Symmetry: C3
Subunit: 145 residues, 3 copies
């Protein structure tokens, strides 16, 4: 669909792979060990710099297994990697558990998902068109069946 | 439009609905009652298995009302449901509040949003093209100026 | 490109800007001060109402800097702003730190990213096609 130029900047850097054929995302591998204390955050280096084809972004998303089993997630999920970013890809992991969480070298601790981007042009208006939803949000449709 | 084949695998399973005509997401209904303690996570079963038309993924997203009013969210938001996944759709709910949170059968506790997928091919390079953002990230553009 | 009609409903409201030329998102500016206590949430008003071109949604996403440095994030990230919503854009910020976090007027405390929407029609089936992933999820591919 699209091309990503990848520059490795760490000996342990891995080109990400789609772990199944129909996978949305490719898993991101830590290049260094990081210990994340209870109720804190750590910054995990992926040791890669990217140039996405124009018109695409990369989302950095939480992996479901680590969330369920260790209460670890990507704190800024979905992390926005901009088309024009040329720095190192890094992942902000939060440990919401009561236990230490250790990231080892090669551990897949997030997934990257490419999405097409769409630029907005804003037009100032005195009034908007009316809809049925209108100003309803934040639970306006209820919870209970 | 696109089509989703849905198989109900639990007696309390419900076909998800778009709650307003221009809603992005369709709401996902719990099939079991689950109590989620303060500062913990619970697994909510939706009792459905999906086959999305090829080319599409499902995102499992937090509902704003429950986040604001109960500090309940989908811990892996946006949860990645792969085109090729044929298992049961499940939601990891975190309770970040100090109060017990009870999910009742039929409760709409997350939403599914269909998105088109875009597969990357990686080309490894020695150097990338330069941009004005460059390696600036993690707050490089400031907060108040 | 696509068009968003924007109505300001607060004197401090700003038209959001893409902060770099290749930025996915436009930053959302608070119009009122909000104090968010440790392990709490606050609702931040952006003072704008939108009408997106049909076929598009707005995602309200966490900014990486504030998450890393202050453990502040958008609690419902990515927040779903529906095509048919005509109310004020608001941001649910959670403070997961042990320190007070103050939002000042003008502070860019989230970003908006436009995405195209795709409406599903459900067809109920007794059986689904088989795949290689099959029922594997929640760690089925490993961590190492
Ligand atoms: O970050 C957000 C998310 C939602 N909203 C508004 C606009 C959106 O169209 C509306 C509903 O969003 P959700 O469907 O994500 N939340 P929920 O299902 O609780 O509310 P509702 O019952 O109104 O659909 O709330 C915001 O202003 N900010
Ligand atoms: O998960 C992430 C998110 C961001 N980043 C990098 C790439 C992105 O282009 C850059 C800025 O992302 P955000 O705009 O989401 N963060 P923030 O607005 O704080 O930073 P900046 O001021 O540089 O835009 O940070 C990562 O490496 N990982
Ligand atoms: O919110 C979610 C996310 C995932 N899933 C299922 C479907 C998805 O295809 C599968 C794997 O999702 P992730 O890739 O996000 N999780 P992880 O990488 O831990 O599992 P796996 O190793 O199977 O890919 O889990 C859910 O049911 N709900
Ligand atoms: Mg996975
Ligand atoms: Mg809703
Ligand atoms: Mg930014």
């Amino acid at each position: 669909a699209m091309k990503i130029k990848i520059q490795k900047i760490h000996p342990n850097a891995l080109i990400p792979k789609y772990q199944t054929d129909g996978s949305s995302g490719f898993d991101l591998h830590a290049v260094e060990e990081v210990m994340i204390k209870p109720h804190s955050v750590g910054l995990v280096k992926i040791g890669i710099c990217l140039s996405l084809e124009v018109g695409y972004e990369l989302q950095v998303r939480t992996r479901s297994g680590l969330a369920l089993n260790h209460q670890v997630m990507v704190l800024n999920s979905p992390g926005t990697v901009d088309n024009d970013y040329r720095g190192e890809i890094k992942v902000i992991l939060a440990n919401l558990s009561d236990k230490d969480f250790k990231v080892q070298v090669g551990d897949r601790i997030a997934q990257g998902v490419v999405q097409k981007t769409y630029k907005a042009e804003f037009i100032e208006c005195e009034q908007l068109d009316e809809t049925s939803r209108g100003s309803g949000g934040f639970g306006s449709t209820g919870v209970s069946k």
